Write a protein that binds this DNA or RNA. Structure first.
Ligand SMILES: Nc1nc2c(ncn2[C@@H]2O[C@H](COP(=O)(O)OP(=O)(O)OP(=O)(O)O)[C@@H](O)[C@H]2O)c(=O)[nH]1
Ligand SMILES: Nc1ncnc2c1ncn2[C@@H]1O[C@H](COP(=O)(O)OP(=O)(O)OP(=O)(O)O)C[C@H]1O
Ligand code: SF4
Ligand SMILES: [Mg+2]
Ligand SMILES: [Zn+2]
Ligand SMILES: [Zn+2]
Ligand SMILES: [Zn+2]
Lengths: 158, 495, 97, 86, 512, 39
DNA sequence: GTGGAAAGGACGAAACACCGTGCTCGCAACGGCAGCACATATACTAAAAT
DNA sequence: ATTTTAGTATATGTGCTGCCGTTGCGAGCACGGTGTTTCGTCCTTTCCAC
RNA sequence: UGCUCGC
């Protein structure tokens, strides 16, 4: 699978749409599970445990969805969830479980839950100066000046 | 009605204030941006391209094509600079030692200088004294550098500051995570254990985990210099009005005018003679374009860093074409002529064009003895006397003499060759036109380029000069022969 | 130019300059090495200290502080080359008085 | 090989990412209004020392009518060193 | 610190004037210097230098110190000039936590720098007499109560007091009185029995003399840090955890300083008894909350002890590091998209990683992930390790490992925010100056109405104000107004990120 | 210095350029001033 | 003596980097003042035994 | 508690690999200029058949 | 750039 083939590669072409759909569906499932756990409000420990989703559970859910024809292994969904973690949207915890319906890792099970971001977008990105690509060439007197800036002009006009 | 503005002032230069320019100042000074790596057009006229190298908006180098910025010919065009933007910053080879020094002076975390408040106040008081000389400035810089290199921890943020040294060519290594023979610090242990994923995916990282110190590429060095407090700038012995620490790392290259880069149009073949600076700038533009192409196409990091190092080396060669730490595989094939080579050497600007230069109104001839002349007199041939002219101003005393000189013309030996009027500065050749009418219209104040006649003070020298007596001012007497004749008693000074 | 076939002129070498210095003839040295060899008139801006053209400074976008100045052409070439080397010479002009 | 460019890149290259809209609420608007009030009230404060006007053309009878009058705060010379007394 | 100097120059010019901002910038750039050399280098008269120095030291922007030969040297505090921008946030938080009385108190303290308690209560009464009407007068009793309530909470602190001249070296007066600070009477208000009623601006001996007060910006910074941590933990787990950590931080405020890696540990019993009764929460629910917060991979709190039931402690430096990480990932996401943010979080979690490993772990196709990596390299968001096989450091025979340094990236982001606020202030001043003609026109046409408001006010002056050509220019006036409003809002909102980055940079240093 | 004088094209301070010359022109320093009638 | 189609030879032309392949040498041209690495010597200081 | 040994800590002091210089001015001449390695477009000339 | 010369 490493030198050729793969669940994502189709005829030597990376399927960005496929991984995007996988990420969106997994995030929607995790968000719905977390919402149900929050609305259950039975007990904080029980809420956290129900918000957690095992890799096998979400893998079976994706298989039940059947978006693509190619068979997706458990480690494929694990890598998709890891990419979602790298997106700053979900959180994974390794708990101790000897054997169960997953049986993937020896004595360890990975549980994933949708988590809200830490802080809202900062104030720097709300200003055109923070997102400027030519910010280095900024100067008081010159061709690129804050007085005659086009970015701030369009931002104030909008 | 009319505003009073001064025409000309007798301005005299007092002193030259050296300094540096920021990239913004480089953009402001330059007129156009050079982005095309080619020189001439595809058509058979081979006109220079627009917004590229050899563009006539940065001056002119040909007698027929005038400058586009200022509508003047080659003799009147002073030249205009240009600015070329670099995708990745590069270390300035001239200030690279200064860059290393500043990095040793300041902290690598909070950008503050490694000096306590008491030492800061002491150095400020020692620097505030008037009449500070260059030697005192360099000595103070040496002392402050030593006292900063003595310390190892920062008193402002508490971060560790290891040794900063030069590895390879134009590469700086800071030994932040140094090996500690005693009990190791938590920082170095965390740094060593942070390579877990790298070791898992690449086992070769584990044996080479040692010697993995910080590499201060131009990006990080520029980012650090941009955050240096202005209070610590005078402590670095650098004048704040002259320049800033961020100016030591160059991001824009000032391409000089065409006056410094003369181009010869060799119509005998399908090519032109260009200086090495034009080729270096062309290669730099090509390297910038290649780096941009690799960034767009998503190339590997190894080749990206190789292109960056090649760009740094080419910029250094453009500045100084004679380096030492150049790799054998990166060594140039031929020999180029950079600015440093143009400045230093026997044929440099200082020794070949500033201290000793060539002048006109001079001749060179073989000498022959003649004892019948006085010791303060020297015989000049008629042929040379007709060529070397002296500008005499028409006054109330020598008017009748200059009239006869003009009447004689450039053929008879006692005479002149050119007449410059007082009102208009348009010279008039005496070989053409009615010389009698010119003599009758000689106004006071006119310049007459008279021939070398008897009584004119003239310098006589032998090129090998040991003492001052090797060159003396004598009185010229014209003789029909073709040699410089003087009294043999003056042979001992000239040797 | 250098040679006779190129219609060149004689060069006042370094030792000749040393002899002229020893004699103390400042005006003769000035006439030889500046007036008769590479005399030129440049335009310097009194505000930024840079070289202008036709009585105009492109750096400051003004022409009030631009003034003419006599100079050897080799000195102007050296100043331009130094500006190309990021070694910017800033000339602070003043009245001859 | 990379292609040659005839014209320089634009002075302000376009970006597909736009700045996030500012936070809204009563707090942000109140802070904005308070900052504007501070800007308006701190210039008339005696601490805001203006540039001393000079080179009066003439003296006139209307000088007393147009004479700018403003109360001046008295600094505590006990804490301030002696070198700043007028 | 060129951007910091530019921002301080803009602030001092907008707030104090021109002849004083030059002295301030000179002090910031050159450091501590005697008065005569400052006057010589600046190029202005001596009286203007003295006035600038006094008006700067009044607002606690500069300090004076004695040295050898009895010379006095003045040093400016760039940090204080930067904190000057946080005045609206200080006023908003003191209006939120307290009544409008404390709001006016803090406003007067910030606008005057140093004042006495009698003076500030008199000014607050005079200003609040305008808020209410119908003959109701403002007494000094409630104002003094609010002032002492602000004092015991360390929001307002007594300025350094000059030592007694008679007891300490009686004789020749020194050039500087050498003000010292005492922690005994730092928050002790004087007993002032005198009361009064504020005047309604009709326009028709000091017991607390020598005792000056000021705003304790350290307390405001601590309160802002606590609010940020509470908001973060609320967005993470729930509002119940936010209330728990708010109660814990409120308990820790008094028993801890402003700079410590860990706070004083608290037990579950005191947290339970100190929690507001509005929450129907039992002891076991609090125990579960604490033990689940201790297991958080963000390490907001920690056990750090088992005695007294559930003993727990709060990690402040770890929370600030997490907040800085969140700010950095958010700015990366908003500047380069979500995929670049994914790559950034990947290269942040994995301390060292290469291009192929990044492509394998992020599932981003080639020719795009390397592009974003190089873009982040060009903006100093990360540094390469460059582990060499040989000391030659040749690129063809070495490994390049990507690694994000949070400290350097945070410093670069703080510099970027400083320059951003400077550019915003410059744009606002430019828009104000370019439209000052229409501003004066509108001021005149509105002062026509502002004059003779009631005395001799005929109705024939109301239909001629809009008759002038100012009516089509009212659109440009509204555009200028909304642009200035948005610029000020952005300048205020960037100050939050500035505070976060500055706190992260401050709490990670040792100052040894 | 002499070298910078030679480079910049100005007369060197050593030699004949150490002193300055003045013209013995017929003049009257501090000439009589016209009185002001209005002031 | 002629022609429609075919090949090949010459001159622009674009990708890449002065050398076909990846190798590969010698010699310093002679002092001479900066140095930076190492190295290492010795003493100062503090921990340990009596 | 005090004298003796261990370490560390910096400074100093002897090297060894760097960079910088090496009279002056004059007059001739010969040669070669960046190109070249392979790909392709164009033009022309000549193997057989008429 | 090379080299032969001229003192
Ligand atoms: N091989 C060779 N190199 C030369 C020749 N002439 C000049 N050069 C090179 O060019 C440099 C000197 O150039 P100059 O002699 O000033 O050229 P120039 O006489 O100004 O050229 P024109 O302007 O065409 O007269 C030297 O460093 C030489 O390497 C020559 O005839 N043969
Ligand atoms: N390389 C040189 N540098 C300076 N001057 C030179 C040089 N070569 C020749 N000259 C000039 O030529 C003169 C040398 O002549 P000199 O050595 O005194 O006599 P000579 O050549 O030995 O004649 P004899 O062999 O004694 O008949 C002196 C000098 O001005
Ligand atoms: S162009 Fe304008 S908006 Fe962009 S960085 Fe410069 S000043 Fe800011
Ligand atoms: Mg001889
Ligand atoms: Zn021109
Ligand atoms: Zn530091
Ligand atoms: Zn100028």
């Amino acid at each position: 699978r490493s030198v050729t083939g793969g669940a994502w590669y189709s005829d030597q072409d990376f399927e960005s749409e496929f991984v995007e759909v996988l990420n969106q569906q997994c995030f929607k499932f995790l968000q719905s599970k977390a919402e149900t756990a929050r609305e259950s409000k039975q007990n904080p420990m029980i809420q956290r445990n129900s918000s957690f989703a095992s890799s096998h559970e979400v893998w079976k859910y994706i298989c039940e969805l059947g978006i693509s024809k190619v068979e997706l292994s458990m480690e494929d969904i694990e890598t998709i969830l890891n990419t979602l973690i790298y997106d700053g949207k979900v959180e994974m915890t390794i708990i101790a479980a000897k054997e169960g319906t997953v049986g993937s890792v020896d004595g360890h099970m990975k549980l994933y839950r949708a988590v809200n971001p830490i802080i809202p977008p900062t104030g720097l990105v709300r200003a055109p100066c923070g997102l400027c690509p030519v910010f280095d060439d900024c100067h008081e007197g010159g061709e690129i000046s804050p007085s005659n800036c086009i970015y701030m002009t369009e931002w104030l006009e909008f | 009605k009319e505003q009073f503005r001064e025409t000309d002032v007798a301005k005299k230069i007092s002193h030259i204030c050296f300094g540096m320019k920021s990239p913004e100042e480089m953009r402001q000074q330059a007129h156009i941006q050079v982005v095309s790596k080619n020189l001439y057009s595809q058509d058979n006229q081979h006109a220079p391209l627009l917004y590229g190298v050899l563009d006539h908006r940065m001056g002119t180098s040909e007698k027929d094509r005038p400058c586009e910025t200022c509508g003047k010919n080659l003799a009147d065009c002073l030249g205009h600079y240009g600015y070329i933007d670099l995708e990745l910053p590069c270390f300035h080879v001239g200030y690279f030692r200064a860059v290393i020094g500043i990095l040793q002076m300041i902290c690598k975390t909070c950008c503050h200088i490694m000096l306590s408040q008491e030492e800061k106040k002491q150095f400020l008081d020692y620097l505030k004294r008037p009449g500070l000389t260059y030697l005192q400035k360099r000595g103070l810089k040496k002392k402050i550098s030593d006292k900063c290199r003595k310390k190892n921890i920062c008193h402002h943020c508490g971060a560790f500051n290891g040794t900063v040294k030069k590895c390879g060519l134009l590469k700086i290594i800071h030994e932040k995570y140094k090996t500690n023979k005693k009990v190791v610090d938590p920082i170095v242990s965390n740094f060593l254990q942070s390579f877990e994923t790298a070791i898992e995916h690449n086992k070769e990282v584990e044996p080479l985990l040692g010697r993995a110190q910080e590499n201060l590429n131009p990006l990080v060095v520029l980012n650090l210099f941009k955050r240096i407090p202005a209070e610590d700038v005078p402590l670095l012995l650098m004048n704040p009005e002259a320049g800033k620490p961020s100016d030591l790392i160059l991001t824009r290259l000032l391409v000089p005018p065409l006056c410094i880069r003369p181009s010869v149009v060799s119509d005998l073949k399908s090519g032109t003679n260009e200086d090495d600076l034009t080729m270096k700038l062309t290669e730099i533009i090509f390297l910038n374009d290649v780096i941009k192409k690799h960034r767009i196409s998503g190339a590997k990091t190894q080749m990206i860093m190789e292109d960056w190092d090649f760009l740094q080396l080419q910029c250094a060669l453009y500045i100084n074409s004679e380096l030492s730490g150049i790799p054998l595989n990166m060594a140039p094939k031929k020999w180029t002529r950079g600015f440093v080579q143009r400045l230093k050497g026997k044929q440099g600007r200082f020794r070949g064009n500033l201290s000793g230069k060539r002048v006109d109104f001079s001749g060179r001839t073989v000498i022959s003895p003649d004892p019948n002349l006085r010791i303060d007199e020297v015989a000049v041939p008629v042929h040379v006397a007709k060529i070397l002219t002296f500008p005499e101003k028409v006054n109330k005393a020598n008017i009748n003499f200059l009239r006869k000189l003009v009447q004689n013309g450039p053929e008879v030996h006692p005479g002149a060759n050119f007449i410059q009027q007082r009102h208009t500065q348009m010279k008039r050749f005496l070989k053409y036109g009615n010389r009698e009418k010119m003599a009758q219209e000689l106004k006071y104040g006119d310049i007459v380029e008279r021939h070398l006649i008897d009584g004119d003070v003239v310098l006589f020298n032998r090129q090998p000069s040991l003492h001052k007596l090797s060159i003396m001012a004598h009185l010229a007497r014209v003789k029909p022969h073709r040699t410089f004749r003087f009294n043999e008693c003056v042979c001992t000074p000239y040797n | 130019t250098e040679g006779r076939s190129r219609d060149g002129g004689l060069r006042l070498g370094e030792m000749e300059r040393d002899c002229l210095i020893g004699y103390g003839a400042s005006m003769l040295l000035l006439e030889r090495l500046m007036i008769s060899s590479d005399a030129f008139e440049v335009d310097v801006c009194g505000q930024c200290g840079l070289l202008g053209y036709s009585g105009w400074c492109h750096y400051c976008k003004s022409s009030c502080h631009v003034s003419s100045l006599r100079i050897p052409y080799a000195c102007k070439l050296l100043f331009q080359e130094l500006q190309s080397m990021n070694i910017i010479p800033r000339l602070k002009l003043s009245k001859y008085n | 090989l990379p292609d040659v460019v005839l014209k320089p890149p634009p002075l302000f290259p376009d970006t597909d990412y736009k700045p996030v809209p500012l936070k809204t609420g009563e707090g942000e608007e109140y802070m904005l209004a308070l900052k504007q009030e501070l800007r308006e009230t701190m210039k008339r404060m005696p601490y805001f020392i203006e540039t001393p006007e000079e080179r009066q053309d003439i003296e006139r009878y209307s000088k007393r009518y147009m004479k700018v009058y403003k109360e001046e705060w008295i600094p505590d010379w006990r804490r301030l060193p002696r070198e700043m007394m007028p | 610190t060129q951007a910091e100097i530019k921002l301080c120059s803009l602030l001092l010019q907008e707030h104090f004037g021109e002849i004083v901002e030059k002295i301030g910038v000179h002090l910031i750039r050159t450091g501590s210097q005697p008065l005569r050399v400052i006057a010589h280098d600046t190029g202005t008269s001596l009286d203007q230098v003295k006035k600038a120095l006094c008006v700067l030291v009044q607002h606690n922007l500069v300090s004076y110190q004695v040295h050898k030969r009895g010379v006095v040297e003045y040093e400016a505090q760039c940090s204080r000039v930067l904190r000057m921008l946080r005045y609206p946030r200080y006023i908003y938080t003191t209006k939120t936590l307290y009544s409008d009385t404390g709001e006016l108190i803090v406003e007067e303290l910030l606008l005057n720098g140093k004042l006495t308690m009698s003076a500030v209560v008199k000014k607050v009464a005079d200003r609040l007499t305008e808020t209410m009407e119908d003959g109701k007068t403002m007494d000094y009793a409630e104002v003094s109560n609010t002032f002492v309530r602000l004092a015991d909470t360390h929001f307002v602190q007594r300025c350094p007091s000059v030592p007694t001249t008679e007891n300490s070296d009686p004789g020749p007066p020194p050039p500087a009185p050498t003000l010292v600070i005492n922690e005994k009477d730092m928050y002790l208000v004087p007993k002032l029995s005198l009361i009064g009623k504020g005047k309604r601006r009709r326009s028709s001996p000091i017991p607390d003399d020598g005792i000056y007060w000021q705003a304790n910006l350290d307390r405001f910074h601590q309160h802002f840090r606590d609010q940020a941590i509470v908001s973060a933990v609320a967005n993470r787990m729930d509002q119940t955890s936010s209330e728990i950590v708010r109660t814990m931080l409120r308990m820790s405020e008094i028993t801890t300083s402003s700079s410590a890696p860990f706070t004083q540990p608290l037990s579950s019993n005191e947290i339970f008894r100190s929690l507001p009764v509005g929450y129907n929460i039992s002891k076991q629910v609090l125990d579960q909350y604490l033990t689940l917060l201790a297991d958080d991979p963000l390490e907001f709190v920690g056990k750090s002890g088992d005695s007294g039931g559930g003993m727990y402690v709060i990690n402040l430096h770890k929370a600030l590091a997490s907040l800085a990480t969140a700010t950095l990932e958010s700015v990366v996401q908003e500047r380069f998209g979500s995929r670049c943010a994914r790559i950034f979080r990947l290269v942040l979690q994995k301390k060292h990683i290469e291009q192929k490993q990044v492509e394998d772990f992020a599932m981003i196709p080639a020719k795009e992930a390397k592009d974003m990596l190089y873009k982040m390299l060009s903006e100093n968001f990360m540094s390469l390790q460059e582990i060499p096989k040989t000391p030659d450091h040749a690129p063809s025979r070495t490994f390049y490992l990507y690694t994000v340094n949070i400290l350097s990236a945070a410093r670069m982001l703080l510099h970027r925010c400083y320059k951003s606020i400077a550019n915003l202030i410059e744009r606002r001043q430019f828009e104000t100056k370019e439209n000052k003609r229409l501003l004066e026109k509108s001021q005149r046409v509105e002062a026509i109405i502002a004059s003779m408001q009631a005395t001799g006010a005929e109705e024939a002056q109301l239909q001629e104000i809009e008759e002038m050509i100012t009516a089509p220019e009212r659109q440009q006036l509204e555009t200028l107004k909304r642009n200035v409003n948005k610029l000020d809002a952005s300048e205020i909102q960037v100050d939050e990120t500035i505070f976060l980055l500055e706190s992260y940079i401050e709490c990670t240093m040792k100052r040894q | 210095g002499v070298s910078e004088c030679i480079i910049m094209g100005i007369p060197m301070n050593i030699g004949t350029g150490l002193f300055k010359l003045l013209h013995k022109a017929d003049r009257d320093p501090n000439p009589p001033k016209r009185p002001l009638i209005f002031d």
